[PDB]
Amino acid sequence: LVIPEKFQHILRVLNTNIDGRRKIAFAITAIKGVGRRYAHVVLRKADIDLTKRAGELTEDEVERVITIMQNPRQYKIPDWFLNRQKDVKDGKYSQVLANGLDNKLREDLERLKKIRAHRGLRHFWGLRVR
Amino acid sequence: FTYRGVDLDQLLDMSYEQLMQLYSARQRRRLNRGLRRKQHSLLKRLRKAKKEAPPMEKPEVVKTHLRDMIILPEMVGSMVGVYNGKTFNQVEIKPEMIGHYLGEFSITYKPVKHGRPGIG
């Protein structure tokens, strides 16, 4: 392979630093809320060859990967694959991202304290739930 | 307040079989299996205690040993005491907690605070 001049050593995506020297799938996996399965399927849906590295990508490809990652369902990602299927509040099939996981984990925890369920009080003392 | 994008009023006026799409798998399986006579008797007891109340006052407390109740949207506003093996715990039925069982609102054990260990 040859030396690409337009190589980004570090990517700055979604309040997250991404190691650009890594493979594309596992660099997308490096953020919260995206594992290897989700990164592989969103990269297959983006019509991008999986053999490339993360830094030597053009900006339009990066922004369309982010676009498909943000809104999965109307880009033909099926509604059994997403992280949050039925939210308690709005009930929308939504795949949440790095700030989204932490925000919605906190809101689920605080509504469980408001409910005063056994799980919420167990989380409050800080013991095993399962 | 909203529950799967559905507000409480159209939760109450909705018929029974559209609630068989809006719960989790466990609650749908239970309510599809059919509720026991004790569930239905407590249901009449709770609706009787709710109708026989002053408008500004909360309903009278209904005490029960039932811990496998699934909170339907009909019991929001009920004043219910649940037995946990030793003592009743009295609770308001809030609408954000319909998708849960009653028995998890009365914990049946004490949190462990460790003392100084003995000889061993």
């Binding site: 009080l121 | 030793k86 715990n89 308001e92």
Partner: peptide, 14 residues
């Protein structure tokens, strides 16, 4: 700081 209807069995939980 104890809720209105809870018992001591669960007041030690809070």
């Amino acid at each position: 700081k104890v809720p209105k209807g809870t018992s001591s069995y669960q007041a030690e939980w809070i």
